[PDB]
Amino acid sequence: SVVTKAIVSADAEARYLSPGELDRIRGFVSSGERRLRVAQTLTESRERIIKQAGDQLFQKRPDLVSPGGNAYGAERTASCLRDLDYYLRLVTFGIVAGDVTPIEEIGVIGVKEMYRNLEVPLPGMVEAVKAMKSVATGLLSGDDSAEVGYYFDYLAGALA
């Protein structure tokens, strides 16, 4: 979370938390109710977001559903919906955490090799997470969408 990063930064310099880091934590805790409400708002529409993201992903990249693609076939769809579900869950975890770290450990550190092994193209991932970004930012309010979009396109950039 933000608190852990602030504590690590303070320990690096062997000093107490600075007032800048202190009111960073103050803004983090004062914004907790909104962030939790956003995390839930993502949660009820999980199936809706995931299915619309998959549809937009097929529309943007027919190659994945095209013959010879890595995602070609009906069996790949069961894994696709579930993986988009994982990444949405990680996005919600990052939203409640206040930073991108939980996403980082759980789904980003080693994703490059993980899809190198499965021969999964990175552009497919970035377009799929962009689809989730579009769907969620459509569902959420503008102020909340501004905050959540960072996590979404951070996942996009990390995937490529």
Binding site: A146, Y150, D153, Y154, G157
Partner: protein, 162 residues
């Protein structure tokens, strides 16, 4: 480094006197754009790789000689170094925008930039063109109001190079 706040504080500390009307005007102008600049910084921090992609595409489409054999960007290593330099420029422009002062640019980019590019043989004019392309892309991405604030520091870097 310095920001607008440090600059005003030092300007009135060396004189030894409190803030006058011009001081408060400078601080109010700096604070008024603060939320817009932070929004732009969040957009850039979130979408830096994209901006690099379109900036590099425009630069290498306008000057294909750079990536063809005999060009300074012709190898995987030199292409990676080019896009890395572009990421440097974007990040330090974001830092300067948030600070409101070009001191960080002079301190940590311009100090030794010309020596580096003249030693390595990097074309300075092409780097200026890449910086301009980055300016255009980031302005299209972050909105005109934040586009001007990005463009002032992008122009500072471009004038520093040329």
């Amino acid at each position: 480094m310095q920001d607008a706040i440090t600059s005003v504080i030092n300007t009135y500390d060396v004189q030894g006197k409190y803030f006058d009307t011009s001081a408060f005007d400078k601080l109010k102008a700096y604070y008024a754009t603060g939320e817009l600049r932070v929004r732009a910084a969040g957009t850039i921090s979130a979408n830096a790789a994209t901006i690099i992609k379109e900036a590099s595409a425009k630069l290498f489409s306008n000057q294909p000689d750079l990536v063809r054999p005999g060009g300074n960007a012709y190898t995987t290593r030199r292409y990676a170094a080019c896009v890395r330099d572009m990421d440097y420029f974007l990040r330090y422009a974001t830092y300067a925008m948030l600070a409101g002062d070009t001191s960080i640019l002079d301190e940590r980019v311009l100090n030794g930039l010309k020596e580096t590019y003249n030693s390595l043989g990097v074309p300075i004019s092409s780097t200026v063109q890449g910086i301009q392309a980055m300016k255009e892309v980031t302005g299209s991405l972050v909105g005109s109001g934040a586009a001007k604030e990005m463009g002032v520091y992008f122009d500072y870097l471009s004038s520093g190079l040329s």
